[PDB]
């Protein structure tokens, strides 16, 4: 049944787009976390290092 | 990640096989079937039978396991590709 | 001293367990609808109380209403049974 | 019929790889920017400790 | 008494399919009392998760059904008298099942719709698991106290030979 095959084709397209959005959203969420983590780690470590010399 | 599997079976099993795929993977499996250009011999009995090829498409190992379980149910011969 | 507290606890537990059971039935409907129809969802969740004299005719009319979408059914189907008290 | 499904499955994995790649490129750029903004604040803290040392001296 | 939950797409909007549905189920004859039902949209994702949920929610359905049926049996086990009133004690949201099924509301405070389908499923399981733990405790108290009072009655029962 070609119309039901075309429904399955349209469904597969809808599934892959949300899977791709979900993976991209997880990578972007991790990017916002790792920005704050790396900024905080670097700034505090170096600030404490120069404060100890001071 | 998207993936697929392929194999062969006696062609008369394909209608029930495809209905079982959508019955287990609730309304969602993409696939194609193709009858072989000649019958092929049974390795045990020597019976020539009109088998058909199939290929089935899915996302991830969870669907892989379902389509595989149905292939095992019909005793379909899966192969890597 | 057990009986009074027990009846009150069992009333709460029955409410919470039955409420939670319908949340599982709603999840079954939701997840199956997404699988049956894909992500651009516009389905309606709907409720029926089948009449015991007409329940078979109801399945036939529901099939006639939904045959073009595809026990088993071409639409999403689930039941709730009130006979929990036996 | 089947030719549309074949092309849709070919494009499906391609579009998925693109969406993941764009997000990974954003992630690498944000991680670099985090180092740069921390370094700008570090230079201000170093400058403050130097000015404070000159005042103590 | 039973109810069915069903779902189907809209032609362009969700209303159109229900307007056809409830008319056919009520106007041809009273085939069923027919209405919309309350289910929210939830944070959907990959097929791998949806297929996992398709079987995990089936195992959970059997579990939560087993819990609610155990509560109903415990109510019959404490109601050694007033047995006919069991239906007036087994209430959901302070009403009989026929009412709460017809008038069901999703609990967005216990089950926040912004959470993943996996998180909501685990929250349900944890909640009914503590109900099952409380049921194990309360049966262990009640059944032993019941058995002890029955043995005290068995010592008191019958003629001068047995009492």
From Swiss-Prot, chain A:
Subcellular location: Apical cell membrane; Cytoplasmic vesicle, Secretory vesicle, Synaptic vesicle membrane; Cytoplasmic vesicle, Clathrin-coated vesicle membrane
Membrane-spanning segments: none
Entry comment describing in which tissues the protein is expressed: Expressed in brain (at protein level).
Keyword Methyltransferase in annotation: no
Residues with PTM Phosphotyrosine: 53
Record keyword Ribosomal protein present: no
Gene Ontology annotations for the cellular component aspect, listed alphabetically: apical plasma membrane; clathrin-coated vesicle membrane; cytoplasm; cytosol; endosome; extrinsic component of synaptic vesicle membrane; microvillus; vacuolar proton-transporting V-type ATPase, V1 domain
Keywords: Acetylation, Cell membrane, Cytoplasmic vesicle, Hydrogen ion transport, Ion transport, Membrane, Phosphoprotein, Synapse, Transport
One GO BP: proton transmembrane transport
GO molecular function ontology, one term from the record: ATPase binding
Role: Subunit of the V1 complex of vacuolar(H+)-ATPase (V-ATPase), a multisubunit enzyme composed of a peripheral complex (V1) that hydrolyzes ATP and a membrane integral complex (V0) that translocates protons. V-ATPase is responsible for acidifying and maintaining the pH of intracellular compartments and in some cell types, is targeted to the plasma membrane, where it is responsible for acidifying the extracellular environment.
Subunit composition and interactions: V-ATPase is a heteromultimeric enzyme made up of two complexes: the ATP-hydrolytic V1 complex and the proton translocation V0 complex. The V1 complex consists of three catalytic AB heterodimers that form a heterohexamer, three peripheral stalks each consisting of EG heterodimers, one central rotor including subunits D and F, and the regulatory subunits C and H. The proton translocation complex V0 consists of the proton transport subunit a, a ring of proteolipid subunits c9c'', rotary subunit d, subunits e and f, and the accessory subunits ATP6AP1/Ac45 and ATP6AP2/PRR.
Family label: Belongs to the V-ATPase E subunit family.
Name this protein carries in UniProt: V-type proton ATPase subunit E 1
UniProtKB/Swiss-Prot annotation, chain B:
Cell compartment(s), UniProt: Cytoplasmic vesicle, Clathrin-coated vesicle membrane; Cytoplasmic vesicle, Secretory vesicle, Synaptic vesicle membrane; Melanosome
Superkingdom per UniProt: Eukaryota
Function: Subunit of the V0 complex of vacuolar(H+)-ATPase (V-ATPase), a multisubunit enzyme composed of a peripheral complex (V1) that hydrolyzes ATP and a membrane integral complex (V0) that translocates protons. V-ATPase is responsible for the acidification of various organelles, such as lysosomes, endosomes, the trans-Golgi network, and secretory granules, including synaptic vesicles. In certain cell types, can be exported to the plasma membrane, where it is involved in the acidification of the extracellular environment. Required for assembly and activity of the vacuolar ATPase.
Family classification: Belongs to the V-ATPase 116 kDa subunit family.
The protein's assembly and partners: V-ATPase is a heteromultimeric enzyme made up of two complexes: the ATP-hydrolytic V1 complex and the proton translocation V0 complex. The V1 complex consists of three catalytic AB heterodimers that form a heterohexamer, three peripheral stalks each consisting of EG heterodimers, one central rotor including subunits D and F, and the regulatory subunits C and H. The proton translocation complex V0 consists of the proton transport subunit a, a ring of proteolipid subunits c9c'', rotary subunit d, subunits e and f, and the accessory subunits ATP6AP1/Ac45 and ATP6AP2/PRR. Interacts with SPAAR.
Protein name: V-type proton ATPase 116 kDa subunit a 1
Species of the source: Rattus norvegicus
Shown stretch of the complete protein: 167 to 247 of 838
From Swiss-Prot, chain E:
Residues the record lists as N-acetylthreonine modifications: 1
Tissue localization of expression: Expressed in brain (at protein level).
Location(s), subcellular: Cytoplasmic vesicle, Secretory vesicle, Synaptic vesicle membrane; Cytoplasmic vesicle, Clathrin-coated vesicle membrane
Chain's role: Subunit of the V1 complex of vacuolar(H+)-ATPase (V-ATPase), a multisubunit enzyme composed of a peripheral complex (V1) that hydrolyzes ATP and a membrane integral complex (V0) that translocates protons. V-ATPase is responsible for acidifying and maintaining the pH of intracellular compartments and in some cell types, is targeted to the plasma membrane, where it is responsible for acidifying the extracellular environment. Subunit C is necessary for the assembly of the catalytic sector of the enzyme and is likely to have a specific function in its catalytic activity.
Record text on subunit structure and interactions: V-ATPase is a heteromultimeric enzyme made up of two complexes: the ATP-hydrolytic V1 complex and the proton translocation V0 complex. The V1 complex consists of three catalytic AB heterodimers that form a heterohexamer, three peripheral stalks each consisting of EG heterodimers, one central rotor including subunits D and F, and the regulatory subunits C and H. The proton translocation complex V0 consists of the proton transport subunit a, a ring of proteolipid subunits c9c'', rotary subunit d, subunits e and f, and the accessory subunits ATP6AP1/Ac45 and ATP6AP2/PRR.
Family: Belongs to the V-ATPase C subunit family.
Name the record gives this protein: V-type proton ATPase subunit C 1
Source lineage: Eukaryota, Metazoa, Chordata, Craniata, Vertebrata
